[PDB]
Structure formats: C-alpha cells, structure tokens
Design a protein around this nucleic acid. Structure first.
Lengths: 113, 136, 79, 178, 116
RNA sequence: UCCUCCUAAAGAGUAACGGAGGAGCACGAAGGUUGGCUAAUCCUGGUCGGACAUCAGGAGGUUAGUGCAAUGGCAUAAGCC
RNA sequence: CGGCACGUAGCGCAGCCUGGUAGCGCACCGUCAUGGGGUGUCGGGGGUCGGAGGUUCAAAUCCUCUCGUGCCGACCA
RNA sequence: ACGACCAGGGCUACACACGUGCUACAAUGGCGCAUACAAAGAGAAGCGACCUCGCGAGAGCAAGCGGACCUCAUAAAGUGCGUCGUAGUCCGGAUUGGAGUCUGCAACUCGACUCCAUGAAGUCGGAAUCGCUAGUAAUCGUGGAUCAGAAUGCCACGGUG
C-alpha cells in the first residue's frame, strides 16, 4: 500500500523511499528491510508481495505519523502549564540547548532583520 | 452640541406650530415640567438646564430630558444682501409646543423637585408649570 | 538535557518529607534545594524552591518531577 | 445499492425502537449530498479550475457545475460574475458508493482520524464535515498534486434534530469522536 | 413546495385569459388522477368536467392516471364540450408544460375538431 | 436644455440667486417571445476560507433586485436564468 | 469671511484627470571604506495619502460633509 | 569593612549589531562494502587491550604498561567495487522530542557524547575585502596540553598535494 500518510515515493531504492515515511528514517528503513528479509537493491517501484505486508506491520510497531506528532506536541504544552524552563522558552521561541542568542539562534528567532 | 450624528439631511424648513401635545406624561420621572407656550430650545438652553438641575438634586434621583432637537434652522450670515442662497446651519432648534414635557426628575421630594426645576427655568424660554407623577 | 539515572532526591527534601508525613500543606516550604525530584507524598504541595534571590512556591505536579524542580523557577527574567 | 438496501432493511428498524412514533415513514432519510470544492480566486482559476473540476469528477461519475459569485465579494474582489467554486449534487447511485468510499476509501485512507467532531447542526440537524485534506482515490491527480486538497461534504438529510442525525449516520458507522 | 410553485405559475395564464373572456380548459394533473374542467365564459361556475374518477371513465382504464385516462378524456373533451356544442375552448395550461398527459387530451381535442 | 422628488396649499399644473440629485447614454441582448426560476439580512454548520468567497440548511418575507439618478411601481412578478 | 487650488514617508512633488498600484529625489537607518568623521560605493525601512466614508468588487482620486494653508477677489460711488 | 566565609544565581542573558573560526550548498560527490599506506606526542586519583554484554556511545571483567616494549591506535581523505542520478535531493545537517551514556553529591539557568526519530536554512553569496610564492596554499585526518568531566579554539604531527 501507500499506508499511513499519503504517498510512498518510487523510481528509487526501497530503503530510501522508506526514509520518506514521516517518522521512519535512515536506520529505521533498512531495519524494516532486515526484518522483512528483503533487499534494497530492488526498488520500492517493484513493491514485493511480501514487503507489502511488513509495510504496515513494522510502521505499526513504531510511533509514527499522527500518533507521534500528537504525543510530542501534547508535551510542548504539558511543561508549559507547569512553569518549566523548556515550557516558556517555546513561546519566546528560544532554544533549550544553551545556544548563542548573543549572536546566533536564527532558527529560533528567525533570520537577521 | 446635540444633533443627528448621521444627518438625515443638512437643512430643513421653518416649520409651523399647530400647538398642543400628545407627549404629556412622565414615563421615567415622577416629577416634571411641561410647557405653556411655544418656541424653540437652541440646545444651549437644554445644556444650561441639565447643568442647573444636577447642581441641586445631587447624586440622588435621576434626570431624563424629553425632546432632542432635530430641526436645524439656518442663519444667513451678516452683511450680505438677502435672498441669494439659503443660509447655513448655526443651530439645532427644538420646536416645542404647549404641554410638551421638557425634563423629568425622580428620586427626590415634591418640594426639592420644584425648587430645582424653578432654578433651571428662566434659562428656559417660555412659561412652565409643574407635573406630579400621576397614577396613570 | 539529562539527569543520568542518578537523579538527586536530596536530603534537604528528606527533612521536609519527615515534617510532611503528618501534615499536608502548612507553609510554603522554604527549600533552597533545587536539584530534587520528589516522592509522591510530597507531590501536591507548595514546594518553595529557591531561585537565587528569594524563593517562589511551586504547585508541583507529577510532570514537574520528571526533571529538577529548579527548572520550574526562572532564575532570570527577560522583557 | 449497498447503503440503499440497508436503509429499507434494518436502519429503519433500529432507529424505530430508539425513537418510536405513531408513524414510520416519518423516519429521517438522507437526501442528496453535495461535494463542494470551492477553488477560489480568479487570477489563473480558469486553468486551476480544470484541475479542481476533474477531482470532483474523480469521486462522482458526472461532471460538476461551477458557481458564479452570489451577493458581494469582499477583499477577494472580482465581481458578481466570475466562476469561482465547483460543486455537484448527488444521485442515490452516487450516494451509496460514496458511502462505501467514506469509510471504505476515506477512513482506511487518511492523514489521521481520531474522529472529527461529536456533533454538527444545521437547523434541522444535518452533519456537514470537512475532510480538511482530500483522500486518495483512483485518480492520476495525486501525481500532479491538486491545488486545494480538501473539500466539504454536507449530507442534507431530512431531520429535525442532530440527536437522530448522528444515529442515522452511525448505522453503517461513521465513527466520529468516540 | 410543489403546491406553492404550481399556484404562482398558473396565476399568469389566469389573468391573460380572464381579460379576453373565454370558455377555458383547465387541466389539473396529479400523479395518480386527472381533474379537467371547463370553466364558464367569465369564470363563476364549471359547466362540464371530467376526471379519472367517473365510472363512465374508468372502464377503458387499466388504472387511474395511466394516459389511457387522457385517452378516455380525449373522448371526454370530445363528449362534454360538444353536448353544450362548445368549441370555444382556450387551453388553460395551469402552469403545466405540454408534455405527457398534458400534451394528451388536448391533441385529442384537435381530433375532435374543437377550435384552437 | 432635459429627467426625478420635495417645496406645491391630498385635481391639475407652479415662483425664487429655494431644498436635493442626475442625463448629454447604453444594449443586438440588457430588445422580443416562450418556458423556467425567486431575494436582502442575519443565524448555524461545513477543507483551503479570513467577520464576510463557495455549499447546505434555518430564520426572515423583499428590509432585495431593477443596464445606469431619484421617486413612484414591480411576486400575476417588469425582476432573474 | 466668500470664491478655488492643494496638503501625500523626515521633507517636497508625481500617481488623481480616466477609482485601485502608491513611485521618485535627497535625507533617516544599516553594511563597507577610512584610524575615525564627513563623503561615497552599497542594502533595507519609511505616507490614518490633511481629517472622513457615501458610491462601489474598488475612493488619495469622483462626489459630499470638513480643517487650516496658499492663492483671487471685499470693488463703482 | 568594596574585607571575610558559605549556599544558590549571574560568567554560556536578549529585541539586536559586529569580528575570528567550523559545516554545507554536491557527483572534482555523498552514502554502503571491503581494502591502501602514517608521522609525532601521552600516561599508576592514568590510558585502558582482551573476553562478555550492549544497535551504540559504552559498561562489566581485567591483562599490560609508569612506558622505541603495553594501552591510547583503528590514521583518515585516498583505492577497487555497490549504488544513488543533479532532485533541495539518496545532498545537508540546524531544531526539537523521546530514549540513553559518562564525570561527579548533584549536570536547573550553563556539560559533552551517543541512539533513534524530526528533519532546518542553504541550490556557492551584492557592495567590499583578506590570506597564501611550495611541501606552501588547498583539503584530509592524527596527537597533545588545560582537561574530574565539555574542543569546530589554541598548540603540534604527518597524508595527498
């Protein structure tokens, strides 16, 4: 299938296109392939009649899609409700990694203006 | 001072009085002034009147003021030969007739009410006369 | 950021718990110890953690002991 | 004729015992649905319009009727002429296959659906719903990607409360928030 | 509302004819019945009439409203007008379009040689 | 100059350097006919969709709409397709 | 006062006429030179359009209400 | 006492500006396999092989060595193949989230590292300006010191060139 989340890309290797499965990435790809006992030399283009099962099965074992994107974003407000550092820093846009906001932090403040 | 905020029209005619009333009864009030005679309030007369009342009845009772002035009434300016254009609105008059209720006191004794209205009046342009609340 | 797997329970909360296993809330707990991560018995209390200047009471929840309690007091203010 | 039968069978029976009356042809039935995708704009929506059309044509087995502006246009502008939406009114035929494509090819196919809304109300209690982003179907317009994914879906059932509107639509299950 | 729409579509005709002053042919359709009545010159009474509901009618009908109910009212238009000899019928369409049964019983009055 | 309304006193028509505004056209449909259709406004719900695009319903009953001023007039609709 | 023309970024005109965008000059501010400035190469920002909204999808405009300001006239005797 | 001693905070704010570096914008390449050769330093509150366990960082077990001996060490670019095909991607890694590791009593503002996920901006940089004349530049690693524990810094060493 195209499974959970619309589209699975094709005209490229199986592992690759599996990285484009909104919560599956570099490792996590070849880890499903290893599981499902199948190659990456073959593309997804070929979509095996075996691999077709394991698509939904192994992405069903991982927190992915809406499920993950829920939980994370539920927790950005969780701390926010409790007067946490991690909390308020999200509504100023600020980091939590001790980064340079004397100079940098132009992914947290947006770019130079 | 007091006038239509969005004007229906800029100018209006002289108008005539035909006297009498139908507006003859306090509906917020319990004491009041009605008219005898006919005329205009130029609204600086309403203003002076609202003022004189308030200083007397104090923060006891409440006041309402029937008639809001709705006829402009122009004055064509000085030192120009007359009948060359209609004049410009220097006023907002309130055509009033006999028995037409002016203002309206409440909340205060019959005597206080009279001798607050007696004080207002004279800054009114006609003869007045007292209203009692009235069962109706 | 991390707590390892040795989170500090702290001793200066230890004392509090023993003066809080017979009493619920009675005061905003003057506790200078920040590096705590408190037992449930002490959850539901106004733990007044020190923030380098004066203390501030914190109406603890269970998700404020996932982590130090110091973190839930600002120690600078921006405007 | 899947949902069609269902109606005349045991939809009517179920609702009956919920909601007894002295009457049983009173029963609230789905009237024609509408599938509206309002394309919007006019700067280039005459080419954009064709894509938006063909997609309503993906679902329904008939082409739609573009709608010209009604009364007023705001800061979008561009007259009381100009076609600017695309909508289509749906046959019984079109209705029961859509109801096996609402739940068979629209909830197995999802971004994510934990429901949407418990209730909806339109003055007699109909349920209208956005998909927000439209679900795949046989179409070659996923390939192309469509300018505006999502549409609206009004059911135009004949009712009198949403307190039966839901039950009606729960018979084959539209799950919603549960 | 079907009864409502009908009414406003009919009050046109029932104003253009009324001025001219005619013996009119009102045709009422109904999915299962037909009423059709020939109103007075000025409109104040009905002189002659037919419907599906006559038994005189019913005999050559499979069921009511089947358009052998307009072929039996091709006969009735033919039979009732020309008893009173009338041929002054002016078709009063009554907001119905000239299709099906409307179309019938009114082509069969053209078969009766009534004047149109 | 011409049109509308008020002034104009409930026939008519009517003054002022009185109070307000338009016109100096347009259209081959915006004409003719025949057939059909019925708003405005707000409420509610509904992807993009914003308070207001579009869709649906409800309330409402022309408060709209009249190719273009204003008045009179328009559901039988002259409107609108 | 009345006539009639126009206030438009810090400041001064275009765009209005024939509804829309709102431009341009130099200044402001930043970069970059230079030791620093000034200048300048060079980058970005700056107008309820004087106040206001009726027409209308659209008003700085057209129209109407209106403010000062400038300009033309308060003359024949 | 602007002395003195301690706990916490502040030294790593921030709405911004500037300087010196690092990493990319790609197939002169990236990732995957295997594979090619080093130099110079370090060390008993040390580096830590081995074997066991861990996806991993690493932990447990502990040999060996105060040292041209042993541990750090496997050099890495490079090469031969596998691939991907010029897409903001199989490029790129920021952000963040979760999970974990280690040094400590304890990593809250102010620790680094790993693991998986998320996956950024950016498709070679206006005006301008600087470095560098050879084993240099360029690029690629390696080692040291300070280091309980934090190197894109400094300091040193070689590879290709």
């Amino acid at each position: 299938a195209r499974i959970a989340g619309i589209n699975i890309p094709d005209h490229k290797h199986a592992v690759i296109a599996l990285t484009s499965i909104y919560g599956v990435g570099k490792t996590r790809s070849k880890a499903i392939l290893a599981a499902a006992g199948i190659a990456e030399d073959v593309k997804i283009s070929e979509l095996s009649e075996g691999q077709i099962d394991t698509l939904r099965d192994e992405v069903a074992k991982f927190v992915v899609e809406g499920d993950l994107r829920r939980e994370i974003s539920m927790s950005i407000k969780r701390l926010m409700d409790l007067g946490c550092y991690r909390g308020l820093r999200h509504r100023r846009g600020l980091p939590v990694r001790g980064q340079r906001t004397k100079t940098n932090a132009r992914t947290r403040k947006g770019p130079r203006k | 001072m007091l006038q239509p905020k969005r004007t229906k029209f800029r100018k209006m005619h002289k108008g005539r009085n035909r006297g009498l009333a139908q507006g003859t009864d306090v509906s917020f009030g319990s004491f009041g002034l009605k008219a005898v005679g006919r005329g205009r309030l130029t609204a600086r007369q309403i203003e002076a009147a609202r003022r004189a009342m308030t200083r007397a009845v104090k923060r006891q009772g409440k006041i309402w003021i029937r008639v809001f002035p709705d006829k402009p009434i122009t004055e064509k300016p000085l030192a120009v030969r007359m009948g060359k254009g209609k004049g410009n609105v220097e006023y907002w008059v309130a055509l009033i007739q006999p028995g037409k209720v002016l203002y309206e006191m409440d909340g205060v004794p019959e005597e206080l009410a009279r001798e607050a209205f007696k004080l207002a009046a004279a800054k009114l342009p006609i003869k007045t006369t007292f209203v009692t609340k009235t069962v109706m | 950021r991390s707590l390892k797997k040795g989170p500090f329970i702290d001793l200066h909360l230890l004392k509090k718990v023993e003066k809080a296993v017979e009493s619920g809330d009675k005061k905003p707990l003057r506790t200078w110890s920040r590096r705590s991560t408190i037992f449930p018995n002490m959850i539901g209390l106004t733990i007044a953690v020190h923030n380098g200047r004066q203390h501030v009471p914190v109406f603890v929840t269970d998700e404020m002991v996932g982590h130090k309690l110091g973190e839930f007091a600002p120690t600078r203010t921006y405007r | 004729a899947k949902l069609h039968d269902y109606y005349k069978d045991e939809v009517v029976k179920k609702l009956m015992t919920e909601f007894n009356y002295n009457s049983v042809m009173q029963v609230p039935r789905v009237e024609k649905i509408t599938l509206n995708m309002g394309v919007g704009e006019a700067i280039a929506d005459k080419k954009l319009l064709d894509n938006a059309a063909a997609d309503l044509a993906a679902i329904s087995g008939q082409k739609p009727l573009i709608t010209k502006a009604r009364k007023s246009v705001a800061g979008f502008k561009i007259r009381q002429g100009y076609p600017i939406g695309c909508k289509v009114t749906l046959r019984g035929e079109r209705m029961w296959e859509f109801f096996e494509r609402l739940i068979t090819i629209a909830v197995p196919r999802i971004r994510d659906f934990r429901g949407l809304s418990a209730k909806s109300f339109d003055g007699r209690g109909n349920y209208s719903m956005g998909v927000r982003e439209q679900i795949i179907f046989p179409e070659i317009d996923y390939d192309k990607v469509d300018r505006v994914r999502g549409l609206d879906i009004t059911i135009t059932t004949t009712a009198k409360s949403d307190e039966e509107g839901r039950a009606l639509l729960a018979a084959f299950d539209f799950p919603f928030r549960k | 509302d079907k009864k409502s729409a009908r009414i406003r579509r009919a009050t046109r005709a029932r104003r253009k004819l009324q001025e001219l002053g005619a013996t009119r042919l009102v045709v009422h359709r109904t999915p299962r019945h037909i009423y059709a009545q020939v109103i007075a010159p000025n409109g104040s009474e009905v002189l002659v009439a037919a419907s599906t509901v006559e038994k005189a009618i019913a005999e050559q009908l499979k069921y009511t409203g089947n358009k052998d109910a307009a072929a039996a009212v091709g006969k009735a238009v033919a039979e009732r007008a020309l008893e009173k000899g009338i041929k002054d019928v002016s078709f009063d369409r009554s907001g119905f379009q000239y299709h099906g049964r409307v179309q019938a019983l009114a082509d069969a009055a053209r078969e009766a040689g009534l004047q149109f």
